[PDB]
Design a binder for these strands. Sequence first.
DNA 1: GCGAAATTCCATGACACTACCTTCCCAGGAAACAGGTTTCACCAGCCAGGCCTTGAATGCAATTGTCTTACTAGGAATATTTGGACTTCCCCACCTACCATTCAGGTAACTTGATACAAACACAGCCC
Length: 81
Amino acid sequence: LQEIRTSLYHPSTPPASSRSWSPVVGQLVQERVARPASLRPRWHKPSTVLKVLNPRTVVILDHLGNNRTVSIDNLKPTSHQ
DNA sequence: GCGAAATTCCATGACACTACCTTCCCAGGAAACAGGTTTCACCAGCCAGGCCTTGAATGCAATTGTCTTACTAGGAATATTTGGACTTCCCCACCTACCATTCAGGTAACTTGATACAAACACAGCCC
């Protein structure tokens, strides 16, 4: 049974598309506003990546003084650095 | 030909009707409250003696309950006559919804002010 468990199907990683982007420690990033009210900013003010944990999970330093460990499906690259 | 600069490219994401709802956090303070201690004074519990009120027994008087009759008025049916509630249609003024502006009130604070309560000695009213 221990050799049954180690022969299981592993999923496939999709090919990385052309307009991907990678976080850089020091790059300016903007989180998404949590529950965006009507006629309000979708995004907060810029923030600087403290630490990168994997290429999908990044610790940013929010305007509140917050070490809010967000995903990279949250963030956007800060335009025109 | 390299580099700098001017330009075209293309992958992508967000717009689609939106707020509540739940549970935990935070928070400051405060709300008293629930908890508890402390002490003094008072109100409640105790018991009995005297008297007054209630209960009962009663006799009787008129009050009340029943019976009977002549009758008055109530009700119903009528025609009609009359008095109106609501449906109808339309327009205007009034209430509202809104923002900006400002004023007033509530909280809050520091002070002030004034009255009520607590105490003491005496007075008056009513009762035994």
